[PDB]
Design goal:
homodimer, alpha+beta, GMP Synthetase, Chain A, domain 3, 3 domains, four-stranded mixed sheet, 8 helices, flat, binds the ligand O=c1c(-c2ccc(O)cc2)c(Nc2cc[nH]n2)[nH]c2c(-c3ccccc3)c(-c3ccccc3)nn12, binds S-adenosylmethionine, binds chloride ion, S-adenosylmethionine synthase isoform type-2 (chains A, B), metal-binding (chains A, B)
Chain lengths: 381, 381
């Protein structure tokens, strides 16, 4: 009574959708290194032997797409045909055009930077929860860390049968606590990871429990009833793009809160700051985290929305789940007094011309590494 | 006090992401017409002059991809270079392989149909709300209907300057009502739609208000304070894939609840029933709607999750927002007694081998047309 199960998932750096996100952001970063005002909307598609870039870029930079793509794939670890994909020998195809002049004229041409219009319509949410220090749901934090642990043990050679494509999933039993949530125990863990042709299933399952799960999940959350689904498909030799096509922006829930809070549908990777799908979601996270770390609430969800060409949000809304003594109306006044959610101001507050985006594109965009949107603003009220 | 704004969006049939969803489901349907057991994972990518199919299909069908793709684009309305895209003359590229044998062996080979494994891990949600008869949020219903109205007036020739690519966005002021939500008024509407080179902005804005909004949104929701952003970019002649690359599965929030409820991240289009991203989300909608139409709650969210190769969900969870006299524990017992959420049973209950998927791929998968997942189950308890 008062408890429920909740599940979130994450994926590894070599998951084919995440490959695409990382490549899209490597392209963005390459442009921004040379032209901080590049307009970038770079989608990546991955299938056996192929990376395709499709989208719209207007930029003063001279970018070697072959090098940028191949270096990103090398970093992920796909470096041999035996692994199913090789940065040295794959096809890299480019279908990139300039940004539509109709978009450019309606969004940013002949506009003062602070008054640039949103690059599109849409809705975006930010969320924070006091259940972890980093203000993220435990389900998603643990799922990300399990993938990171796999990559670590692959790269350090202790589990050399590992390959880069992985997925994880964590189910936690939660208790209610005055509108907030408290994690009690881990009910179920799934891990699936691509592997070489030589290792056997029992060796993999033993390693995944002892060297991955136990190295990540605190023992206080694990008990004799916890259910483990380790390599549940039985065989995962074919992987990466060869096993499953990847596309940019197909892991938007992994990128955010693991299903908690809410999501407006927009993808992050491959987009410069004028695309509010990214910048306003980052700003909304920053607002939410600022409210929780400032002691105003324990758990909070912020919605913003925009119209293409219009700088100020059309709507700003807040829900605190009953975890503040202040009304949501009062919290909204505090937010309005402390934040300016025009994209041309967000860019300054969060330093969004800086080429740090490839680092955001695996293991979630939130709750990690003290990115600007993770540093709470001191609120005046 | 007790009120908040909430925004949802929708897109039209010629929006480039939605083009991709529709093509992916046209391909699925073509396979299912000949082989009800086809294994389909068809991604579509669209950019100027190009439809690319990428993914994995194992099927006994003989499908003419050129015809299927081009007929889908014709139906949407892209039939001339003057509109930016033409089904008769575009490039159709195919990068389709068989389903991975490692997946096939772990999911469905040599398994009894009812006991087939989930085609992947993941989490899925179903939602229902009593605020409309179709048990959907008003924000998303209105946003979809505005796009449908644009397509209607394009196809009937009364606004012949319209083209197929459109987006809409609706902000509603809601009041709290004992855990449920009540819509009060429409605060803001956005409409952006591709148009010919001859029509002027004032003609478009007048038509969008008088012939689109007033034909869709009840006057009781509109007042002298409602804000209208009609063609806010000022010019939208370039559109469709030429204006913005499209990909399958990039409108997952438009496809579902417009940001309400929750989303697990999986895309629907291009996937047969063994992909629980689709089948289990449909079943979860069916459960949620059955609970509301059965009088057990006014508003409800259901989560399910799976592991690849495992037939039964790993977790089932329910949240009723305080809108039931029964506890969520009791509702879960009712759900367990009345539903079987194995994919190999869902397929029978919801008739998921039937080639009806292209019809789901615009205007949302839920709340429309009495699809099987929209017909409530009579609950025994
Ligand atoms: O706040 C809550 C509470 C809650 C928290 C503290 C309190 O004092 C009172 C109630 C809650 N309580 C219970 C109890 C039995 N079942 N549920 N369940 C949930 C869910 C959720 C759960 C199961 C499936 C689906 C969504 C969510 C959510 C999660 C993700 C996205 C959107 C909503 N929030 N939430
Ligand atoms: O249930 C509620 C209630 C509520 C309903 C009936 C009651 O008797 C008591 C409370 C509520 N109340 C208020 C009041 C002032 N602000 N909020 N606000 C919300 C939101 C939401 C709102 C603004 C931004 C973001 C999310 C949501 C939601 C919507 C989509 C996804 C997830 C959660 N639910 N919700
Ligand atoms: C299961 S595949 C999706 C379904 C697939 N498109 C098909 O044709 O059936 C989704 C993800 O699961 C992982 N995956 C691929 N092959 C797998 C296998 N043999 N066992 C487990 N997971 C696998 C990869 O991370 C892949 O991107
Ligand atoms: C604004 S575009 C996204 C940003 C774009 N990729 C870029 O290069 O800036 C997203 C969607 O908005 C719509 N759109 C395209 N051109 C537009 C215009 N000139 N005015 C308004 N909306 C437009 C189309 O539905 C398109 O798919
Ligand atoms: Cl996936
Ligand atoms: Cl191998
Ligand atoms: Cl879009
Ligand atoms: Cl024209």
């Amino acid at each position: 009574e008062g408890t429920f199960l909740f599940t979130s998932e994450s994926v590894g750096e070599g998951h084919p959708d995440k490959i695409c996100d990382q490549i899209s952001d490597a392209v963005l970063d390459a442009h921004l290194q040379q032209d901080p005002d590049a307009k970038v909307a770079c989608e990546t598609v991955a299938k056996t032997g192929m990376i395709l870039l499709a989208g719209e870029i207007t930029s003063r930079a001279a970018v070697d797409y072959q090098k940028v793509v191949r270096e990103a794939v090398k970093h992920i670890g796909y470096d041999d045909s035996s692994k199913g994909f090789d940065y040295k020998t794959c096809n890299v195809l480019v279908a990139l055009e300039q940004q539509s002049p109709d978009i450019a004229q309606g969004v940013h041409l002949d506009r003062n930077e602070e008054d640039i219009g949103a690059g599109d319509q849409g809705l975006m949410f930010g969320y924070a929860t006091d259940e972890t220090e980093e203000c993220m749901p435990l389900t998603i934090v643990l799922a990300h860390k399990l993938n990171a642990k796999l990559a670590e043990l692959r790269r350090n050679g202790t589990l050399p049968w590992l390959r880069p494509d992985s997925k994880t999933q964590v189910t936690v039993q939660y208790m209610q606590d005055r509108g907030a949530v408290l994690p009690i125990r881990v009910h179920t863990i799934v891990i699936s990871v691509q592997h070489d042709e030589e290792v056997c299933l029992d060796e993999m399952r033993d390693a995944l429990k002892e060297k991955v799960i136990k190295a990540v999940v605190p023992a206080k959350y694990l008990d004799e009833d916890t259910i483990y689904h380790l390599q549940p498909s039985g065989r995962f030799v074919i992987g990466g793009p060869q096993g499953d096509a990847g596309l940019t922006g197909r892991k938007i829930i992994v990128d955010t809160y693991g299903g908690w809070g809410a999501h407006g549908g927009g993808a992050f990777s491959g987009k410069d700051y004028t695309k509010v799908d990214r910048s306003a979601a980052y700003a909304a996270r920053w607002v939410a985290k600022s409210l929780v770390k400032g002691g105003l609430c324990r758990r909070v969800l912020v919605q913003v929305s925009y119209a293409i060409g219009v700088s100020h949000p059309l709507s700003i809304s807040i829900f605190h789940y009953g975890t503040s003594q202040k009304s949501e109306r009062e919290l909204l006044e505090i937010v309005k007094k402390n934040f300016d959610l025009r994209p041309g101001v967000i860019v300054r507050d969060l330093d969004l011309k800086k080429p740090i985006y490839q680092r955001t594109a695996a293991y979630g965009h939130f709750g990690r590494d003290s990115f600007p949107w993770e540093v709470p603003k001191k609120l005046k009220y």
